[PDB]
Design a protein around this ligand. Structure first.
Ligand SMILES: [Fe+3]
Ligand SMILES: [Fe+3]
Ligand SMILES: [Fe+3]
Ligand SMILES: [Fe+3]
Ligand SMILES: [Fe+3]
Ligand SMILES: [Fe+3]
Lengths: 164, 164, 164, 164, 164, 164
């Protein structure tokens, strides 16, 4: 399969670049907005993306006999101006990851690769999981105007049989 | 200090890009050369570079009041043809990291930043440590022709009061 | 070395006088501003300054063969009018301690006393540490208008491989 | 009560200044007289005076509604010439603290402050305790001419239901 | 670096020769002066010098790529006549080791070897430590005329966050 | 006995000089031949020679009333060119120590010193022990051409009721 190889290479690319952008966003949150726990939350996301999400693709390429490609071009030229705008940007990125994974699953099923539809089930599920736990934090900025209350709730968040 | 800020931004850049190149090299070693433990060794290096080596720079920039920049451009268009050539490439990269850190230390001392010379002592020491433990593996390919013996020695390597 | 002796005597003087001023400020915070945990924080600072920060200078003078001098003149004739102004005063004092220590380090290196540059590394590092943990509390008074929320955060604060 | 306020402010002043003088005397004992355990004894006295003896006065002023004043002027321009003369100086200072506390107790009883009498009982008792344990060490320099025997006895001292 | 290589070779030489001279001095103290614990103290010094103080130089030469040289010429043709003279000789030797290490540190900094200034910091500190603990025993022979009291104190000596 | 005194002084001399030569040989093995475990083996030999083998002679001289002499002149101007040649040199040195000890034992028995024949029995036995465990490693270089196999066997060696 060359179409599956191309799609999975693209997914690897996007995961690396999201990881780097999230690292920068966590620095900007902790430093410029005085919210260290929002920074720890975004940093947990960044480590998640730069770890197992590409570790698994490399392992699968070892097992099935496909080729790997590395091509990265990241740049951060503009940041949001609040913390609410920051977390809303994060939400949009996750929501786009969902559609990319859906396209991959459809492609895997259209060619009779049932081992590639089995692999992509993990990503199908983790997409909804991560989007849900990001919306959890998005919703707090609509419930309160006090930054310290929000930060205490996020601290408590930081420190399921189908999805979880 | 703007010179110190620029030098540390460049060091951040180089660390990210070395991490990505090492990830690709570990895949190529394990997959194309049938040496999984050489791959685990290079992957340990990659995680080292992509973790604390830039985590510390971001923390220091939080503490002292400097600015961060993110600009990454990595590409892998050619690989070595043996495993000895691979590990020798790794050795050259580490040896260049040494000179970059030495230049930073000299610059920190030339301006009377004694908190930035205190900071860069850690990197001054870890450079020699990492270069030494990479030369340890470089030397095995000159001691034996049997790939399985080398791989057993590397497995045993995988699983000091001044440097260590 | 007479220049090093004079510089270290001056540092001893300043440490004693900062300790006394911080004791008075902690009383004024707890009593006149109804913030007992801000008082506990400033009192921890005062004990820090009046303890090891001069204990170490006396020990070093025992070891290397220098002389000690005692000359103290402290007076508190005016206090701030809020708690934010109080903690900002504390921040300025710490920031001046930083420059004094930097001058001492430069002087130690200009004379070939490498045992006195080894000694002053501890102070070089503890300066940035203490300034950072004071700015942590400075920042809370810009995040909230409720005194009880701030006080709960400070209580939680009250009860690193390079700096910490 | 303004007379009680003035008397307690003066006691705070004297305690701070005795603490500083005792710190200098301990340095001079251990450095210039080769008796490190006499130095540790005098340093224990200094920490005692600079700690709870003024901590309690600040706490009482918090509780009863009095004002605090800070005004310190210490200088050490002349030291004794033996170790016996040093410890005899220490004895005289303690004996004067006794009379100051006695005057405070009389004043508290002359005005019908029975909460200031209850407070000063602690100092009434600790005066005799500290004077007794200082005379214990004063007496050794009349029992022996050998400095090492005296130092061993003091080391053993370093490492009651009414007074103690 | 050839100057650094030469300086470190000389330091290796001096350490070996001091170790041998201290072994002979410990024999002469225990046998000819009837002070076995002074002998144990000097023997501890000798083992210290003949162990890690040259073990570390050989390890560093393994790591950085320098050459080793061995050239030893020791002879003991005259000893002191008391035990005080013996320990004073020991004190002078340590005090000369201090100046040799200071010269090495200056040379390392004059050439931009910041890995050799990181290495020599250990010796910079251990010099003052060892000189202090030797002066501790030097001072006892001025406090007492009784050999058994001195010997008991030394026995008790035999059986810090900056220096220690 | 003056003949016994002279013989034991010579044995002390030879032990010190063998210790120093073995230290240099261990450095040369680990550094120039890429065999760290052969280096650890030779270093263990060096530590034995520089420790108890002369500790016991000094103790015996304390007990029986003989005199000590210190006269050392070591130099290393030429090394072997393989690792087999290195270990064969080590073997010859041990074999010569055997004959020296045999001569001492004969001399002790020729004069009716039965306390010096009781003393030299220990050396008579340890000679054969050390020669045997050195020949164990000598024999491996005739069994294999692979350096890593030899090194694994030596590692396993590194980590009797009559001799042992
Ligand atoms: Fe995830
Ligand atoms: Fe590293
Ligand atoms: Fe501090
Ligand atoms: Fe007391
Ligand atoms: Fe030492
Ligand atoms: Fe032996």
């Amino acid at each position: 399969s060359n179409k599956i190889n191309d799609a999975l290479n693209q997914h690897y690319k996007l995961n690396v670049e999201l990881g780097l952008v999230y690292a920068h966003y966590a620095h900007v949150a902790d430093d410029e907005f005085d919210m260290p726990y929002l920074g720890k939350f975004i940093q947990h996301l960044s480590e998640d993306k730069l770890g197992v999400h590409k570790e698994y693709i490399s392992d699968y390429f070892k097992r099935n006999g496909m080729k790997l490609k590395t091509d990265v071009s990241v740049a951060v030229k503009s940041i949001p101006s609040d913390a609410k705008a920051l977390i809303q940007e994060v939400y949009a990125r996750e929501n786009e990851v969902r559609d990319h994974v859906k396209a991959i699953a459809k492609l895997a099923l259209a060619e009779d690769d049932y081992e590639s539809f089995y692999f992509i089930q993990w990503y199908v599920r983790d997409g909804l999981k991560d989007l849900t736990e990001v919306d959890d934090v998005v919703k707090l900025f609509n419930s309160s105007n006090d930054k310290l209350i929000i930060e205490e709730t996020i601290k408590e968040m930081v420190e399921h049989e189908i999805w979880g």
